[PDB]
Amino acid sequence: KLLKDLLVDRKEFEDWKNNLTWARDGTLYLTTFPDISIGQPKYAKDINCNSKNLFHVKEFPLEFENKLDFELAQQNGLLNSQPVCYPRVCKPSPIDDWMAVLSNNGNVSVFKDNKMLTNLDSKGNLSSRTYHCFEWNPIESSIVVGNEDGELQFFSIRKNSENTPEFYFESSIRLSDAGSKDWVTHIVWYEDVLVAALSNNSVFSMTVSASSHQPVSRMIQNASRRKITDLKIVDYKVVLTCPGYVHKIDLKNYSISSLKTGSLENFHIIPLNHEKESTILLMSNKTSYKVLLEDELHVTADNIIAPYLEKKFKKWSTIWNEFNNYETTLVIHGISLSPDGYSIAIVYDMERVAFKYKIASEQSFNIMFAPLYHTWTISERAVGLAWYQTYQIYNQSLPKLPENFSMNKKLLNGNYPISLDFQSYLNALMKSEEMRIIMFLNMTIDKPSILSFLEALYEYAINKKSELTNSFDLACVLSIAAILKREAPIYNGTLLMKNSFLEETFNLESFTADPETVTSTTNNTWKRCGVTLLPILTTHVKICPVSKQRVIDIKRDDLNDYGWFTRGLLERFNEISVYCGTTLEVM
Amino acid sequence: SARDKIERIYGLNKEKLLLLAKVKEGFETSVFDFPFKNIQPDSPYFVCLDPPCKKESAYNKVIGDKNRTVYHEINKTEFENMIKLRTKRLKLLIGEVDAEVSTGDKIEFPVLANGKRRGFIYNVGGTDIAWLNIEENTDIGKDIQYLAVAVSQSSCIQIFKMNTSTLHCVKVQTIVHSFGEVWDLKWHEGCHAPHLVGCLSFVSQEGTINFLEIIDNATDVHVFKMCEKPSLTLSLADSLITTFDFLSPTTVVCGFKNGFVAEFDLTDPEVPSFYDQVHDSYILSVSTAYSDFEDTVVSTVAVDGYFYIFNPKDIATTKTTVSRFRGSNLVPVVYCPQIYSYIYSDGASSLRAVPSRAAFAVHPLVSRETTITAIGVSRLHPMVLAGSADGSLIITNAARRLLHGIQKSLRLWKWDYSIKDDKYRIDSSYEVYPHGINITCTKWNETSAGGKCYAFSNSAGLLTLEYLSLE
């Protein structure tokens, strides 16, 4: 039935505000105080149903810089009131491996792992330059901030100075009138349409799209004293919560419909995206339910979570052993969907009467992981272990998979775009639907295979036979030809490979002798590269955490003269596993 | 002297800084006492920062038409097997004079010694006064002012008409509620219209903040009314309100027994504009930090020990921790508007001020020996009254290094019970700092007329009032 809950020990949160996110690649992020806490995605062939073996939780210390550092607080005033910088909200990119953090001082900074990339900044004012929310572009690689002017500033990327990402200001939109300083307090960005909200709870929407179009924005709700609790967007339908209300707004046709909640204690919306049925899950500390988003809102109960939750919460009635001899409530510190949206993670806590504070470090939580449906799929919205997690959370059910797909059936249905330049050709394959399914399934089976991929590789090389004049490239395609039990080009050299301190030469023959190892001229046998099938002479490898296949780290290889084919591979798969598409770990 | 400390703490803005120029200069002399001249409108140093619940004059928008309060059965004997507050006479000792006051009596200073001080000690039904409150006012009350006194025994509210320049006064109304203990007592000030007094606000131990019209012209000097239905009762089912401050003439902030803070609209109650959790439990006090130059901001301390300042526009992004205490049962907090700072105690025995725009610049003010029980500040002057659990009122000037940036402060009174005699002593006696006694609340009159008046009660029921000087 359900995965065993994950202990998060001796952390604390600044507020009851939703501090949980679940990143594409399967990582959990909690915005705890004073550091972010991370649930590192881990692979174990078996977990006795303990989500402990899916995420190992760790402190994720970061180095926030204050762009406003030397700036005297102004219209806000509460600005640099707290000098030391710590994280408030955190949202990983839905697209790239990458993540932004709003700090307590209105800075939005972008991070690759821990190294900061660029701290978003622009124009002037200060009012203009201090932020209260940010959203990632769900379609391409950009980001939006909201500032204290009631304005949205947009940032695009490349710029580069050699392959280092780097953001820059791109455009803005004013939302409130000039003679006013309500701030932007919410931005949800979905597909082709963007919706934001202001301090005065007025709400706006636009189409940011063909960018040359200076995007026309339209107010979809008057200013109101009713503070917007949570704002999201379900297939071109905007959903707000309130104190005691839920409002829905059809962008599709421009019409509002809203329902009371009784609870009057603010609470969050979880969209149930795989419904073909415009459905959501309102959920609070106290209770929770389904709401269909037809013209009429409809409450059906199920909740598919509350069954599980109140089961756990009733069991805890021994630590208060039945009766009101104390006073208990379930506390939610965060909720987040799977990147693929098939599971749910809930950070929660359960306590009692009048409390006895209990210092900082001392205090634990639980993360519950639960499936939202009866079946799932390998979504493009998750990668690597994130898929594996869904697999596990769905009790080891294989995902759907197209009819007549089989694991040894050709990439792109055999129809290989060999006319492309090598690097486009590899992207082409990586994006392919088959590669994805194969990658995930490799996490399921005893012996990860990449044959369907290797064949595509081979058909590419062969096409350019007169251009395989590099011996590493040679040794490489020779090796591939062998695995594929397929006609190789002939050849007659040896190969010489190095590491910092030593060399081993190899006869081009001996690349066909064995799929796993190659043996040298001096009779020392080494393991193979696994992207390249080349010899491994060096500590400096990366390792795929599922297959344990070891890949040559080209970024640490000054010594060896890799040819177009062989290098183009090692560059391209320097960080991602071809076997399961999880990210490779420096060993 | 203090040139870019003041810039560091308050920002630029040639205006606000000039307000601060007037404060530094006006009261920089005033170690323990300020010249009366500096409070008058025509003074070149006059700085007066009204609270949010003026500036609009509410009334018609809030108490409007048929929300009005209710009836009045005097009978006194009615009042008495209903709020049993007496029998006894408390034995007193002022300076060296033995007196024997029963309830409803007072001792007046101008017939005491030299008879030079102005002011009295009054014996409210003692015991004790929950909170009291001088309702700032000048609008057909030449030198006449009203001050409310909340008292518990089911428990009630007394109302005093008083002269500013002689500190005479009468008890004008005794309103019996059954709201139990009542605190954060304060007058709206946006309530007026004719047909007597102003209108009055408080949280009750029933968990609701309620407002009531105080009304009764002198066709009967002293009445006994029975408030039976408040004009307005902000409430939230399953939560209980523990503290409230005004945000505008038409909105309030409040905290709850559960850690939540809400914003309520007096034109439209019941449905709170927001309701979010801020603390772990019982919120002991919440105060508003109004400034003509920054977004108004709210502070909040609880039994959890924490003390935050946030902006209601969006708490989530503004929540700022000033400090965390060893979690008192009482941590009283007020906003002292001339320095834009909150004045609060920790748990124990030290006053601190923290500017609302500079949470990092905590200045300790005083710290002595006994859990500080209450504190009073003003719109007119930067002086802080502060009453401890040892029964002692302390005055002191904010303008610490708060407008000084390179000393501290004196006691005006000290109550004392007997070690068997039944003799309560007050000590006029000067002394500078480098049960059935203590102090439950102390507040300034805050009008240009009686700006130098203040009141302070102790749990014993002895409410004393003075006009400040050099004895």
Curated annotation (Swiss-Prot), chain A:
<dbReference type="GO" id="GO:0006384">
    <property type="term" value="P:transcription initiation at RNA polymerase III promoter"/>
</dbReference>
<comment type="subunit">
    <text>Heterodimer with TFC6. Component of the TFIIIC complex composed of TFC1, TFC3, TFC4, TFC6, TFC7 and TFC8. The subunits are organized in two globular domains, tauA and tauB, connected by a proteolysis-sensitive and flexible linker. Interacts with SPT15 and directly with TFC6.</text>
</comment>
<dbReference type="InterPro" id="IPR024764">
    <property type="entry name" value="TFIIIC_Znf"/>
</dbReference>
<feature type="region of interest" description="Sufficient for SPT15-binding">
    <location>
        <begin position="398"/>
        <end position="587"/>
    </location>
</feature>
<dbReference type="GO" id="GO:0003677">
    <property type="term" value="F:DNA binding"/>
</dbReference>
<feature type="site" description="Involved in the interaction with TFC6">
    <location>
        <position position="357"/>
    </location>
</feature>
<keyword id="KW-0805">Transcription regulation</keyword>
<dbReference type="Pfam" id="PF12660">
    <property type="entry name" value="zf-TFIIIC"/>
</dbReference>
<dbReference type="InterPro" id="IPR015943">
    <property type="entry name" value="WD40/YVTN_repeat-like_dom_sf"/>
</dbReference>
<dbReference type="GO" id="GO:0005634">
    <property type="term" value="C:nucleus"/>
</dbReference>
<dbReference type="InterPro" id="IPR036322">
    <property type="entry name" value="WD40_repeat_dom_sf"/>
</dbReference>
<protein>
    <recommendedName>
        <fullName>Transcription factor tau 60 kDa subunit</fullName>
    </recommendedName>
</protein>
<dbReference type="GO" id="GO:0006383">
    <property type="term" value="P:transcription by RNA polymerase III"/>
</dbReference>
<comment type="function">
    <text>TFIIIC mediates tRNA and 5S RNA gene activation by binding to intragenic promoter elements. Upstream of the transcription start site, TFIIIC assembles the initiation complex TFIIIB-TFIIIC-tDNA, which is sufficient for RNA polymerase III recruitment and function. Part of the tauB domain of TFIIIC that binds boxB DNA promoter sites of tRNA and similar genes. Plays a role in TFIIB assembly through its interaction with SPT15/TBP. Essential for cell viability.</text>
</comment>
<dbReference type="GO" id="GO:0000127">
    <property type="term" value="C:transcription factor TFIIIC complex"/>
</dbReference>
<keyword id="KW-0804">Transcription</keyword>
<keyword id="KW-0238">DNA-binding</keyword>
<dbReference type="GO" id="GO:0042791">
    <property type="term" value="P:5S class rRNA transcription by RNA polymerase III"/>
</dbReference>
<keyword id="KW-0539">Nucleus</keyword>
Swiss-Prot record, chain B:
<dbReference type="GO" id="GO:0000127">
    <property type="term" value="C:transcription factor TFIIIC complex"/>
</dbReference>
<dbReference type="GO" id="GO:0003677">
    <property type="term" value="F:DNA binding"/>
</dbReference>
<keyword id="KW-0805">Transcription regulation</keyword>
<keyword id="KW-1015">Disulfide bond</keyword>
<dbReference type="GO" id="GO:0005634">
    <property type="term" value="C:nucleus"/>
</dbReference>
<dbReference type="GO" id="GO:0006384">
    <property type="term" value="P:transcription initiation at RNA polymerase III promoter"/>
</dbReference>
<feature type="region of interest" description="Sufficient for interaction with TFC8">
    <location>
        <begin position="1"/>
        <end position="469"/>
    </location>
</feature>
<comment type="function">
    <text>TFIIIC mediates tRNA and 5S RNA gene activation by binding to intragenic promoter elements. Upstream of the transcription start site, TFIIIC assembles the initiation complex TFIIIB-TFIIIC-tDNA, which is sufficient for RNA polymerase III recruitment and function. Part of the tauB domain of TFIIIC that binds boxB DNA promoter sites of tRNA and similar genes. Cooperates with TFC3 in DNA binding.</text>
</comment>
<dbReference type="GO" id="GO:0042791">
    <property type="term" value="P:5S class rRNA transcription by RNA polymerase III"/>
</dbReference>
<dbReference type="GO" id="GO:0006383">
    <property type="term" value="P:transcription by RNA polymerase III"/>
</dbReference>
<dbReference type="GO" id="GO:0000995">
    <property type="term" value="F:RNA polymerase III general transcription initiation factor activity"/>
</dbReference>
<keyword id="KW-0804">Transcription</keyword>
<feature type="disulfide bond">
    <location>
        <begin position="191"/>
        <end position="199"/>
    </location>
</feature>
<keyword id="KW-0238">DNA-binding</keyword>
<keyword id="KW-0539">Nucleus</keyword>
<protein>
    <recommendedName>
        <fullName>Transcription factor tau 91 kDa subunit</fullName>
    </recommendedName>
</protein>
<comment type="subunit">
    <text>Heterodimer with TFC8. Component of the TFIIIC complex composed of TFC1, TFC3, TFC4, TFC6, TFC7 and TFC8. The subunits are organized in two globular domains, tauA and tauB, connected by a proteolysis-sensitive and flexible linker. Interacts with TFC1, TFC3, TFC4 and directly with TFC8.</text>
</comment>
